[PDB]
């Protein structure tokens, strides 16, 4: 579950761009 | 919205695999020549690196000829083709009803994704000789001419053949719309789950079609596959089998289906291109040697399973376009010698005003008396004989006078019957209303009424029977025969009505 | 010997043996399938490779599968236990009744009887049908041809011929369904089960059905008439008896051959047909002959594409036909059943050297009177009965009586008319017609003869309905 | 709807374009170790 | 015809036929290794400017080329098999594609001795200790006896991870494909 | 990258690359040519080769010339700066007026709009032509087609449709002549300058032009259609406008494909046409549909070899049209210009829900009467007209009246017939045909209805004909 590097990288970037909205 | 796209990311499959692989040697005209793939099954789905698909059609000793499922602009000599191990298969189920899917069962409707659970091959074999049982039930098409003179039982292939713009798709769509009354009612032994495969048409035409079906609220039970003109040749050669498998699911699940290929003379052209480019030997009109096996192994899945295999069914109405009544061309005869009938449409009749332009002289159904309800059987036997008598002496019509009163009677009956068979567009009629009209027609309750007015009468009569004597119609429908009481009641309604008009 | 597949181009496989090749026409079993896939060699391409035509769907074949050479051409069971069964081209039953337990096997590719075997005397096969045995007599070991479409009583005529031959001549029958619609295949199976030619209970069936469906790949619709021929060659040779052989249809035989020839890459011939059309038809129509052990008659349905009687397929078939039986719709409206047309039905043996002078004079007189009546029909229709003298009205009355007397009640058709099946022997037909022509019965009402067997029953019917 | 469609179809492109430049960092050792482990598992499950 | 021993790998075309013939003929008489040595030798001997120039002109009578090849093959003292093969190629006129033959034959001998092709395309430069672990783990894919012939390749065009080919088996764990796969899945 | 020419057979050049191959459909620039020569890749022959069709004559090509891979398919200028500018297949001006100064380039090989984008609305268009507006009404923003052999009137009819709709149309327009005469090319150019739709002084032009007239090599006639289509596709998508797209012919496109198919090593299909006829036509005729982003009203003049409508080219094209208006030579040799065949002509918007009961029933009465007249002609040829019935001669006279009334004098045909152009609003056509069918003009001579606009002109002509009697 934690192994995926680029997948969870996409997830982290989506969280960051989510916070950017507001 | 980002809160929504992270479950989009999570719901993926990141894992990798040890997979086989070949490399393209050549490409062009939509035909890759992959090299390698030593363990590739004939007719198997391979995937190119760029993302396209392919169906490894031609296993030659040194290379495998794959046919790309799309523009090969994305492919180059050197690319990697990774096999998947799976023959071509498609989703099925009742999740498709109301959707629009492409040749591979991918929703091209927007409107969300398909939620099907079960998939199914596309190259299955037809049921054998024992599973089938004789064709007995009728498929009410809602069209007066089709439903009385050239009947269509459930489990029967019935070619719809005719020149361009004579009303073939219109017949198929009237058939689709008619099933609403059944698919809204209760009994599950009369529900038909129409399917409509659109091959070679342009997306504007399929869009207008789905608009008609939605207006008539006839999509809640229809699937609409579509391999439209811009979709590469393999996706048109393969759409009919996707449709026929979506229908085989119902058939072997004890349900009743109905599949309309439109046209098949464009699947044949797509297959001819696929072959000529793979360099397979050509034949008459350049079609390969399989253009009979092609159709035959398709139109032979339309069966009527017995009661031990479920009791399901799958009608089939392949639409064929003939170049100026050239029924002797290759494909028209290939598909006329596979099916159980033909509903011939002609353009001399379409412009004389006989719409639907069916040509009862050439149209036949090889089940015949069966595949009709006893009521419609009683009416249509006499109607068929009367029309046959009319046709053979219609040549004198232009004179009429100067002739024996017997042939004058024959013409004065045939004209009324011909005018009764004229029908509107997307106005199918339940069987009992057809029986009422054709009873008023064949028993002489119009011979003294001028032909020009018959159409009026027809409509008026219907409105005067639908809103007044629904009990009589229900009596005819629930038991599909005309008991002497019902016969006399019909006579009284017809006579008294005609008197007051 | 085990070769390996090396190519799968459509329905044409190519197998690469090493140790020793199989001679052309051997059947190879493809190892690793669940349904029995059988290839049949058709060429040798050098380099220990053979191009085989596949007898079933070739999806899922992998370059490298093992193909095991059987040793002899496609082999089928041919005992008497193949009676009342259905079996596909390779001899595998498809009636869901179990294995066809037989002690014999026969290869479907056997050469025609040598010249010494051929029998030199042209006999006449007594079918027991008045019209057929009178105007278009069927010859033993002759390739009859049955024209006419559907709705005119063709399946009923087939079942009646089967029954009559099984009773009169004590000879079994066969039914090779070349390209046989699956729906119509099932309907024919159940029609026979009804009429009783096939019998599921006691093993006293008179037909050995053979079906190459319309969806089976082309290589397995050409070799189904050969399966029927082998099943019937067993009865002719190993049991010395007459046999029927219905090949419905004999245009789909040429169609299957043409498709196979195109697949093997051969240049198309005149109209797109295979270059070997004539020889392909010959090497199958030449086993249907009367040797000294027995005989194989054959009633082959014919489709004439686009009404072209010059088309190479119906032009290559007619070079073999020894008869004809033009079922017509116009004669079914009158109710005269069988619908066999008397004026179109030809026959090569309708010659006084073979049938006999009496038979020939009677048949020619019937034909002439029927032609004259057909002509007078036009005058009557145009002008009226008045326009005719009695020198013509007598011929009209005789012609109506004859047209009636040609109708016969079949045994299998009891379900329709209720009447009893009458197997009128040849002599009775000849006497009846020779007498109706001699005016001996010009007074009986026509309905005396309608649907009767001999003439004596017509007399009895006249007496009954005249009181 | 239209606004949401525009929003999401821009979000996807923006973030993927950020990622295709974020991968240029120095995480190579982790990727190589993970891939060698994947080889371990594939070889084990490949026979 | 006489039974012949098939190669381990199949090559197709003209070179395929000639290489198969030579390999089957060499397996009999067991002269495979020295046959490959002589094939490599003729490789260069057919690249000298005069020979490579006179064996392309089509106006040198065929018999002239055959005799010149025979004379050259006496000086180089080839085995009967290799001299016969050079002759054969000479008079069939197919010597213009001699390099295709020997190359194919090499691929026919490599698999005979069991050295499966491999390849590891990397996201960027790679260490050699990493290459050590790579070889030691890829050896886990072979059968019992085979050998690994790994041809590394650097590739920054991919994003991360690596692409490993082994014979045909192709395993792709490059971050680039992961990115496009994810974008596909969540689109 | 940079490859080399290895073979030059006819108008097909095989180029060998040592670097990375260029994907299919790219554009390759052959170096050292006085006039820019652009090849398009169409195959990958294997062995690091490609095979390309050349868009200009292959004179002077030398085995070994260096060839530069452009990188992307043929890119052409687009925008409102290509209005009133003639263009090549490769978007380079051929009007001797200097480069096309634009900002956006577009690549001609795009994809079709997908099903979710199709627009399902349709409403009649008024062309001011009696027969067309009556029996085959033209859907606005819907593909149209003008079949018919040679010399029947396809070009004159397209000239009329331009003359009327173009000026009477707000949004831009494009005319993409594919493989037709060059004389007509400059005739159109001059006519449009006269009309003012093209101005050589201001930026007020409304029509862009594209020309691959038939002196160009086959490689450059299979693609000029795509150039014009690209320009119009831009005016639809990016400019959010309404576009008229005239193509003439669009059979030269399939013919020019057929000309090179054989050299590309392809077995030839039915009638010598390339095996890929249907899909090559589909991938083009489905970038012309109206979508939810903009509207294209596409009028295409489709040749018909030897007036055979069964030929694979027109037979295939019939599936890609809304309104098909089949001109006939049997009717053009009676002087009934436009030659339209009232019975072969068809339209998708001929349903009473979209034209109403009056128009629908008028048209169906017209068709019924014409077909009945055809049926009688079989009889009049044995009897003679006198021996007919008395109710028939009425129908034959009515059919002749209608058949003559469907003719019309065109604004561009003032030089052929010497007449004056006429337009007829739809309501008036319906009025006239209602009256003719009802018998209200059964007393007038037939020659009163020949080459007249509204019916009132028919009565005036009947007068002026009876005066000089
Ligand atoms: N029952 C009818 N009454 C009146 N008009 C009809 C009827 N049936 C069909 N038409 C007309 O026929 C025209 C063609 O109809 P349809 O598309 O069904 O034929 P088609 O052969 O499928 O056309 P194509 O072959 O071009 O796809 C339609 O415009 C329709 O108006
Ligand atoms: N001897 C007969 N007596 C009465 N009716 C017959 C006779 N022979 C045939 N028929 C009629 O002809 C029809 C023939 O149908 P069938 O044999 O099933 O297929 P086909 O119509 O192709 O022959 C039957 O339905 C039957 O009513
Ligand atoms: N409305 C018309 N009135 C008179 N003649 C016409 C009309 N339309 C076309 N023609 C005739 O047709 C010829 C032009 O044919 P054209 O349309 O150029 O052929 P194509 O349709 O093959 O391009 C003219 O010479 C003219 O005689
Ligand atoms: Mg249609
Ligand atoms: Mg022109």
DSSP track, F63-91: TT-EEEEEEEE-EEEESTTSTT--B-TTS
Are B95 and B114 in contact, with CB atoms under 8 Å apart? yes
Q: How far apart are CA F246 and CA F255, in angstroms?
A: 19
Question: Which one-letter DSSP state was computed for residue D32?
Answer: H
- State the nearest Cα–Cα gap between F206 and chain B, in angstroms: 28
C421 CA to centre of ligand 1 in angstroms: 52
- Termini Cα distance of chain A: 30
Q: Are residue E108 and residue E161 in the same domain, yes or no? A: no
Cα-trace Rg, chain C = 25
DSSP bridge pairs for B54: B46, B68
F156 CA to centre of ligand 3 in angstroms: 6
- If one residue of B159, B161, B169, B170 were mutated to test the ligand 1 pocket, choosing by the most ligand atoms within 8 A of its CB, it would be B170
Q: Are residue E21 and residue E79 in the same domain, yes or no? A: yes
Q: Are residue C318 and residue C223 in the same domain, yes or no? A: yes
Are C53 and C39 in contact, with CB atoms under 8 Å apart? yes
Reference F155, options F130, F193, F190, F187; nearest CA is F187
Residue E133, CB half-sphere, CA atoms under 13 Å: how many? 12
Q: Is B234 in the pocket of ligand 1 (CB under 6 A)?
A: no
Largest interatomic CA distance in chain D:
52
Q: How far apart are CA B365 and CA F245, in angstroms?
A: 47
Q: Are residue C225 and residue C128 in the same domain, yes or no? A: yes
Q: Are residue C80 and residue C64 in the same domain, yes or no? A: no
Q: Are residue B223 and residue B283 in the same domain, yes or no? A: yes
Structure tokens at F211: 């020309």
Q: How far apart are CA B236 and CA B199, in angstroms?
A: 6
Q: Are residue E155 and residue E89 in the same domain, yes or no? A: no
SS3 content of chain D, % helix, strand, coil (to 5): 85, 0, 15
Residue located via tokens 């006329």: B336
Q: Are residue B180 and residue B222 in the same domain, yes or no? A: yes
Are F22 and F28 in contact, with CB atoms under 8 Å apart? yes
Q: Is C416 in the pocket of ligand 2 (CB under 6 A)?
A: yes
Residue located via tokens 């199949």: E10
Q: Is C149 in the pocket of ligand 2 (CB under 6 A)?
A: no
Backbone angles phi, psi at C50, to 5 degrees: -130, 135
How many residues in chain E? 187
Nearest residue in chain B measured CA to CA from E181: B14
Q: Is E28 exposed, middle or buried (0-12, 13-18, 19+ CB in 10 A)?
A: exposed
Q: Are residue E43 and residue E75 in the same domain, yes or no? A: yes
Are C54 and C37 in contact, with CB atoms under 8 Å apart? yes
Reference F412, options F129, F159, F126; nearest CA is F159
In a domain, B3, yes or no: no
Residue located via tokens 């004859």: C402
Contacts of C295 (CB under 8 A, 6+ apart): C119, C140, C141, C236, C242, C243, C289
**CA-CA-CA-CA dihedral for C160, C162, C165, C168, to nearest 10:** -60
Residue located via tokens 């008397």: C342
CB contact under 8 A, F46 and B282: no
Q: Are residue B215 and residue B271 in the same domain, yes or no? A: yes
Q: Is B395 exposed, middle or buried (0-12, 13-18, 19+ CB in 10 A)?
A: exposed
Backbone angles phi, psi at F288, to 5 degrees: -110, -10
Between the CA of residue C420 and those of B400, C129, E99, what are the distances in Å? 47, 14, 87
Last residue of a domain, one of C349, C377, C412: C349
Q: Computed from CA positions of residues C99, C105, C111, C117, in that sequence, does the dihedral angle turn out positive or negative? A: negative
Reference C127, options C110, C114, C139; nearest CA is C139
Structure tokens at C67: 């193909």
Residue located via tokens 């409403």: F123
Of F115, F119, F290, the CB nearest to B108: F115
CB-CB neighbors (< 8 A) of B83 in chain E: none
Backbone angles phi, psi at F220, to 5 degrees: -100, 5
Q: How far apart are CA C427 and CA C169, in angstroms?
A: 16
For atom 26 of ligand 3, which residue has the closest CA? F416
Reference C414, options C106, C27, C156; nearest CA is C156
Residue B162, CB half-sphere, CA atoms under 13 Å: how many? 28
Q: Are residue C341 and residue C360 in the same domain, yes or no? A: no
B139 CA to centre of ligand 1 in angstroms: 22
Q: Are residue C124 and residue C177 in the same domain, yes or no? A: yes
User: Breaks in chain B follow which residues, C to N over 2.5 Å?
Assistant: none
Q: Are residue E26 and residue E64 in the same domain, yes or no? A: yes
Q: How far apart are CA C42 and CA C14, in angstroms?
A: 10
In a domain, B8, yes or no: no
DSSP bridge pairs for B107: B101
Residue located via tokens 């260069």: E44
Q: Are residue B394 and residue B454 in the same domain, yes or no? A: yes
Nearest residue in chain B measured CA to CA from A19: B2
Please write down the long-range contacts of B419-424, taking CB distance under 8 Å and 24 or more positions apart. Answer: B419/B451, B419/B454, B419/B455, B420/B144, B420/B446, B420/B454, B420/B458, B421/B144, B421/B145, B421/B149, B421/B354, B421/B358, B422/B353, B422/B354, B422/B355, B422/B455, B423/B143, B423/B144, B423/B145, B423/B355, B423/B356
Residue located via tokens 């480069």: F99
Are F245 and F229 in contact, with CB atoms under 8 Å apart? yes
Q: Are residue E147 and residue E56 in the same domain, yes or no? A: no
- The angle formed by the CA atoms of residues B260, B266 and B269, to the nearest 5 degrees, is 145
Q: Are residue C63 and residue C34 in the same domain, yes or no? A: yes
Are B9 and A14 in contact, with CB atoms under 8 Å apart? yes
Q: How far apart are CA C321 and CA C306, in angstroms?
A: 20
Residues of B annotated catalytic, as ranges = 366
- Termini Cα distance of chain E: 61
Q: Are residue C204 and residue C336 in the same domain, yes or no? A: yes
| DSSP per-residue string spanning C310-332 | SSHHHHHHTTTB-B-EEB-SHHH
Contacts of B42 (CB under 8 A, 6+ apart): B56, B57, B59, C8, C58, C59, C60, C61, C62
Last residue of a domain, one of B372, B391, B416: B372
Beta strands in F26-170, from DSSP E residues, in sequence order: 26-30, 37-43, 49-54, 66-73, 75-78, 104-107, 124-125, 138-139, 144-146
Q: Computed from CA positions of residues C31, C33, C38, C44, in that sequence, does the dihedral angle turn out positive or negative? A: negative
Q: Are residue E15 and residue E85 in the same domain, yes or no? A: yes
DSSP bridge pairs for B41: C62
CB contact under 8 A, D42 and B17: yes
Helix (H, G, I), strand (E, B), or coil: what is residue C145?
strand
Q: Are residue E48 and residue E80 in the same domain, yes or no? A: yes
Residue located via tokens 């017995």: B306
- Termini Cα distance of chain B: 67
Helix (H, G, I), strand (E, B), or coil: what is residue E10?
coil
How many CB atoms sit inside 10 A of residue B258's CB?
27
Residue F84, CB half-sphere, CA atoms under 13 Å: how many? 21
Q: Are residue B300 and residue B229 in the same domain, yes or no? A: yes
Question: Which one-letter DSSP state was computed for residue F13?
Answer: E
Structure tokens at F324: 């098909």
Q: Which of E140, E169, E172 to mutate to test the interface with D (most CBs of D within 10 A)?
A: E140
Backbone angles phi, psi at B7, to 5 degrees: -75, -25
Reference F405, options F465, F342, F319, F344; nearest CA is F342
Are B311 and B132 in contact, with CB atoms under 8 Å apart? no
Q: Are residue B322 and residue B456 in the same domain, yes or no? A: no
Q: Are residue B144 and residue B81 in the same domain, yes or no? A: no
Q: How far apart are CA F238 and CA F229, in angstroms?
A: 14
CB contact under 8 A, B27 and F43: yes
CB contact under 8 A, A15 and B2: yes
Are B312 and B253 in contact, with CB atoms under 8 Å apart? yes
* Residue range of the domain that includes E157: 115-187
Q: Are residue E9 and residue E84 in the same domain, yes or no? A: yes
Backbone angles phi, psi at B345, to 5 degrees: -115, 140
Reference C45, options C21, C74, C69, C71; nearest CA is C21
Between the CA of residue C321 and those of B128, C133, C166, C315, C325, what are the distances in Å? 33, 17, 23, 10, 11
Between the CA of residue B492 and those of B440, B447, B468, what are the distances in Å? 10, 17, 13
Are F339 and F148 in contact, with CB atoms under 8 Å apart? yes
Q: Is C329 exposed, middle or buried (0-12, 13-18, 19+ CB in 10 A)?
A: middle
Structure tokens at E145: 């006896």
Q: Which of E2, E3, E12, E13 to mutate to test the interface with C (most CBs of C within 10 A)?
A: E3
Are C283 and C248 in contact, with CB atoms under 8 Å apart? no
Of B5, B16, B17, the CB nearest to D11: B5
Residue C225, CB half-sphere, CA atoms under 13 Å: how many? 30
CB-CB neighbors (< 8 A) of E162 in chain D: 32, 35
- What distance lies between CA B173 and its chain's CA centroid? 9
Which residue in C140, C143, C160, C180 is the catalytic one?
C180
Nearest residue in chain B measured CA to CA from A18: B2
Reference B500, options B476, B473, B468; nearest CA is B468
Q: Are residue B164 and residue B134 in the same domain, yes or no? A: yes
Reference F22, options F57, F72, F59; nearest CA is F72
Q: Are residue E95 and residue E147 in the same domain, yes or no? A: no
Backbone angles phi, psi at E72, to 5 degrees: -60, -35
How many CB atoms sit inside 10 A of residue F237's CB?
16
Q: Are residue F356 and residue F341 in the same domain, yes or no? A: no
Cα-trace Rg, chain B = 26
Q: How far apart are CA B484 and CA B476, in angstroms?
A: 11
Of D14, D18, D31, the CB nearest to A5: D31
Are C435 and C441 in contact, with CB atoms under 8 Å apart? yes
Q: How far apart are CA F75 and CA E13, in angstroms?
A: 41
B169 CA to centre of ligand 4 in angstroms: 4
H or E segment and range at residue F312:
helix F312-317
| E residues 128..157 contacting B (CB < 8 A) | none
Last residue of a domain, one of B63, B86, B109: B86
Last residue of a domain, one of E112, E129, E155: E112
Contacts of B496 (CB under 8 A, 6+ apart): none
Q: Are residue F57 and residue F81 in the same domain, yes or no? A: no
Alpha helices per DSSP H over chain E: 14-27, 32-45, 49-54, 62-75, 80-91, 98-113, 129-138, 175-186
Q: How many domains does chain B have?
A: 3
F153 is in an annotated binding site: yes
DSSP bridge pairs for B81: B22, B48
Residue E128 Rama label (left phi>0; alpha psi -120 to 50; beta): alpha
| DSSP per-residue string spanning C205-252 | ----EEEEETTS-GGGTSSSHHHHHHHHHHHHHHH--EE--EES-SHH
Backbone angles phi, psi at F38, to 5 degrees: -120, 120
Question: Which one-letter DSSP state was computed for residue E70?
Answer: H
Question: Which one-letter DSSP state was computed for residue F327?
Answer: B
Q: How far apart are CA C5 and CA C68, in angstroms?
A: 10
Q: Are residue B349 and residue B377 in the same domain, yes or no? A: no
CB-CB neighbors (< 8 A) of D12 in chain E: 183, 186-187
Reference F165, options F328, F296, F301, F348; nearest CA is F296
Q: Do chains B and E touch (3 or more CB pairs under 8 A)?
A: yes
Q: Are residue F462 and residue F432 in the same domain, yes or no? A: yes
Beta strands in F170-313, from DSSP E residues, in sequence order: 173-178, 207-212, 242-248, 295-301
- If one residue of F146, F154, F156, F451 were mutated to test the ligand 3 pocket, choosing by the most ligand atoms within 8 A of its CB, it would be F156
Q: Do chains C and B touch (3 or more CB pairs under 8 A)?
A: yes
In a domain, B34, yes or no: yes
Reference C161, options C248, C75, C282; nearest CA is C248
Q: Are residue B217 and residue B301 in the same domain, yes or no? A: yes
How many CB atoms sit inside 10 A of residue B326's CB?
12
H or E segment and range at residue E48:
none
Backbone angles phi, psi at F141, to 5 degrees: 60, 45
Are F55 and F90 in contact, with CB atoms under 8 Å apart? yes
Are F118 and F302 in contact, with CB atoms under 8 Å apart? no
Q: How far apart are CA B236 and CA B228, in angstroms?
A: 7
Are C168 and C128 in contact, with CB atoms under 8 Å apart? yes
For atom 9 of ligand 2, which residue has the closest CA? C153
H or E segment and range at residue C112:
none
Q: Are residue F216 and residue F261 in the same domain, yes or no? A: yes
- State the nearest Cα–Cα gap between C253 and chain B, in angstroms: 13
- State the nearest Cα–Cα gap between B429 and chain C, in angstroms: 29
Q: Are residue C156 and residue C181 in the same domain, yes or no? A: yes
Residue located via tokens 């096939």: C198
H or E segment and range at residue F395:
helix F392-405
Are C287 and C112 in contact, with CB atoms under 8 Å apart? yes
Between the CA of residue D13 and those of A17, D6, D16, what are the distances in Å? 12, 11, 5
Q: Closest ligand 3 atom to the C-alpha of F151?
A: 19
Q: How many domains does chain F have?
A: 3
Between the CA of residue B344 and those of B160, B164, B319, F289, what are the distances in Å? 6, 12, 10, 32
Contacts of F199 (CB under 8 A, 6+ apart): F84, F193, F205
Last residue of a domain, one of E112, E127, E148: E112
How many CB atoms sit inside 10 A of residue E134's CB?
25
Q: Do chains D and B touch (3 or more CB pairs under 8 A)?
A: yes
Beta strands in F161-214, from DSSP E residues, in sequence order: 173-178, 207-212
Last residue of a domain, one of F296, F331, F349: F349
Q: Does B7 touch chain A (CB under 8 A)?
A: no
Residue located via tokens 């009556």: F134
* Residue range of the domain that includes C119: 74-349
Q: Are residue E18 and residue E33 in the same domain, yes or no? A: yes
Reference F257, options F49, F40, F44; nearest CA is F40
CB-CB neighbors (< 8 A) of B17 in chain D: 42
Q: How far apart are CA B8 and CA A10, in angstroms?
A: 11
**No. of helices (H) and no. of strands (E), chain F:** 12, 16
* Residue range of the domain that includes B222: 87-372
Q: Which of A6, A10, A15, A16 to mutate to test the interface with B (most CBs of B within 10 A)?
A: A10
Reference C270, options C320, C315, C219; nearest CA is C315
CB contact under 8 A, C19 and E6: no
Q: Does C187 touch chain E (CB under 8 A)?
A: no
Residue located via tokens 């006269």: F194
Q: How many domains does chain E have?
A: 2
């Amino acid at each position: 579950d934690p192994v995926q590097k680029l997948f969870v990288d996409k997830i982290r970037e989506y969280r960051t761009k989510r916070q950017t909205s507001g | 919205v980002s809160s929504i796209l992270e479950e989009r990311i999570l719901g993926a499959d990141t894992s990798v695999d040890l997979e086989e692989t070949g490399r393209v040697l050549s490409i062009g005209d939509g035909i890759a020549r992959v090299h390698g793939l030593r363990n590739v099954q004939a007719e198997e789905m391979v995937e190119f690196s760029s993302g396209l698909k392919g169906m490894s059609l031609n296993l030659e000793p040194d290379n495998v000829g794959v046919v790309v499922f799309g523009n090969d602009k994305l492919i180059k000599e050197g690319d990697i083709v990774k096999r998947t191990g799976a023959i071509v298969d498609v989703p099925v189920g009742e999740e498709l009803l109301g959707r629009v899917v492409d040749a591979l069962g991918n929703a091209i409707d927007g409107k969300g994704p398909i939620g099907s659970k079960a998939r199914r091959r596309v190259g299955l074999k037809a049921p054998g000789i024992i599973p089938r049982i004789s064709v007995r039930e009728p498929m009410q098409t809602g069209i007066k001419a089709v439903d009385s003179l050239v009947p269509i039982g459930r489990g029967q292939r019935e070619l719809i053949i005719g020149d361009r713009q004579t009303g073939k798709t219109s017949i198929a769509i009237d058939t689709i719309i008619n099933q609403k009354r059944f698919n809204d009612g209760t009994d599950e032994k009369k529900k038909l789950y129409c399917i409509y495969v659109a091959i070679g048409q342009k997306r504007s035409t399929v869009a207008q079609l789905v608009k008609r079906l939605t207006d008539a609220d006839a999509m809640k039970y229809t699937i609409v596959v579509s391999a439209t003109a811009s979709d590469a040749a393999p996706l048109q050669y393969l759409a009919p089998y996707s449709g026929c498998s979506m229908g085989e699911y119902f058939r072997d699940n004890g349900k009743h289906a109905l599949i309309i290929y439109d046209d098949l003379s464009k699947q044949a052209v797509a297959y001819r291109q696929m072959s000529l480019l793979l360099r397979r030997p050509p034949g008459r009109e350049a079609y390969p040697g399989d253009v009979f096996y092609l159709h035959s192994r398709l139109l032979e899945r339309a069966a009527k399973m017995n009661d031990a295999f479920g009791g399901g069914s799958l009608t089939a109405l392949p639409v064929i376009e003939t170049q100026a009544g050239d029924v002797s061309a290759y494909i028209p005869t290939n598909v006329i010698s596979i099916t159980d009938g033909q509903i011939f449409l002609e353009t001399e009749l379409f412009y004389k005003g006989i719409r639907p332009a069916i040509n009862v002289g050439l149209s036949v159904s090889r089940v015949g008396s069966a595949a009709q309800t006893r009521a419609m059987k009683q009416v249509a036997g006499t109607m068929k004989l009367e029309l046959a008598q009319y046709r053979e002496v219609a040549a004198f019509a232009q004179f009429g006078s100067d002739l024996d009163a017997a042939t004058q009677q024959l013409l004065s009956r045939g004209v009324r019957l011909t005018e009764l068979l004229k029908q509107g567009q997307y106005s199918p009629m339940a069987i009992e209303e057809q029986v009422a009209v054709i009873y008023a027609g064949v028993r002489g309750y119009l011979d003294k009424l001028e032909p020009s007015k018959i159409t009026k009468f027809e409509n008026a009569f219907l409105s005067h029977v639908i809103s007044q004597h629904q009990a009589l119609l229900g009596k005819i429908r629930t038991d599909g025969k005309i008991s002497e009481e019902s016969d006399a009641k019909l006579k009284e309604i017809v006579t008294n009505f005609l008197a007051g008009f | 010997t085990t070769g390996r597949i090396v190519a799968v181009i459509g329905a044409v496989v190519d197998v690469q043996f090493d140790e020793g090749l199989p001679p052309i026409l051997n059947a190879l079993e493809v190892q690793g399938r669940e349904t029995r896939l059988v290839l049949e060699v058709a060429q040798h391409l050098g380099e220990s490779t053979v191009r085989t035509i596949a007898m079933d769907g070739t999806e899922g074949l992998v370059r490298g599968q093992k193909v095991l050479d059987s040793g002899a051409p496609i082999r089928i069971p041919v005992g008497p236990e193949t009676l009342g069964r259905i079996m596909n081209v390779i001899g595998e039953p498809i009636d869901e009744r179990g294995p066809i337990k037989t002690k014999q096997f026969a290869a479907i590719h056997a050469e025609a009887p040598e010249f010494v075997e051929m029998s030199v005397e042209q006999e006449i096969l007594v079918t027991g049908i008045k019209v057929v045995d009178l105007l278009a007599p069927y010859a033993k070991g002759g390739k009859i041809g049955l024209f006419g479409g559907a709705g005119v009583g063709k399946t009923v005529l087939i079942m009646e011929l089967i029954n009559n031959v099984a009773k009169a001549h004590g000879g079994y029958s066969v039914f090779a369904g070349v390209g046989e619609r699956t729906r119509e295949g099932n309907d024919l199976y159940h029609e026979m089960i009804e009429s009783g030619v096939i019998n599921l209970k006691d093993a006293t069936s008179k037909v050995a059905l053979v079906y190459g469906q319309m969806n089976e790949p082309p290589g397995a619709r050409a070799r189904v008439a050969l399966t029927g021929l082998t099943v019937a060659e067993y009865f002719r040779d190993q049991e010395g008896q007459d046999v029927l052989l219905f090949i419905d249809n004999i245009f789909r035989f040429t169609q299957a051959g043409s498709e196979v020839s195109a697949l093997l890459g051969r240049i198309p011939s005149a109209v797109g047909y295979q270059p070997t059309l004539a020889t392909d038809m010959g090497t199958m129509q030449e086993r249907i002959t009367t040797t000294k052990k027995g005989s194989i008659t054959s009633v082959q349905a014919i489709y004439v594409p686009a009404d072209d009687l010059t088309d190479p397929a119906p032009a290559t078939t007619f070079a073999h036909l020894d008869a004809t039986t033009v079922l017509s719709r116009a004669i079914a409206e009158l109710g005269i059943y069988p619908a066999v047309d008397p004026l179109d039905s030809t026959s090569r043996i309708m010659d006084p050297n073979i049938v006999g002078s009496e038979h020939y004079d009677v048949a020619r007189g019937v034909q002439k009177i029927l032609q004259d009546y057909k002509s007078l029909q036009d005058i009557i229709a145009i002008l009226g009965m008045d326009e005719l003298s009695e020198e013509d009205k007598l011929t009209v009355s005789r012609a109506r009586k004859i047209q009636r007397f040609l109708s016969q009640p079949f045994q299998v058709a009891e379900v329709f008319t209720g009447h009893l099946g009458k197997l009128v022997p040849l002599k009775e037909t000849i006497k009846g017609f020779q007498q109706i022509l001699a005016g001996e019965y010009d007074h009986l009402p026509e309905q005396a003869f309608y649907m009767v067997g001999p003439i004596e029953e017509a007399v009895a019917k006249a007496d009954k309905l005249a009181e | 709807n239209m606004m949401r469609q525009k929003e999401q179809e821009h979000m996807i492109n923006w973030v993927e374009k950020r990622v295709v430049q974020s991968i240029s960092a120095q995480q190579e050792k982790e990727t190589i170790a993970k891939c060698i482990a994947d080889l371990k598992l594939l070889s084990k499950k490949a026979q | 015809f006489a039974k012949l021993v098939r190669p381990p790998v199949q090559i197709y075309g003209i070179e395929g036929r000639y290489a198969t013939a030579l390999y089957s003929a060499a397996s009999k008489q067991n002269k495979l290794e020295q046959v490959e040595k002589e094939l490599l030798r003729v490789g260069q001997i057919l690249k000298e400017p005069k020979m490579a120039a006179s064996l392309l002109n089509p106006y040198v009578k065929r018999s002239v080329k055959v005799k010149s090849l025979s004379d050259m093959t006496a000086k180089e003292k080839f085995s009967p098999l290799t001299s016969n093969l050079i002759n054969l190629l000479a008079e069939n006129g197919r010597l213009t594609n001699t390099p295709a033959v020997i190359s194919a034959f090499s691929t026919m001998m490599s698999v005979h001795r069991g050295e499966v092709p491999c390849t590891v395309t990397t996201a960027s430069a790679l260490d050699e200790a990493t290459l050590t672990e790579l070889k030691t783990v890829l050896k886990s894919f072979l059968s019992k006896g085979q050998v690994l012939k790994l041809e590394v390749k650097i590739d920054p065009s991919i994003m991360g991870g690596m692409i490993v080919r082994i014979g045909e088996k192709y395993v792709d764990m490059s971050a680039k494909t992961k990115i496009q796969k994810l974008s596909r899945a969540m689109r």
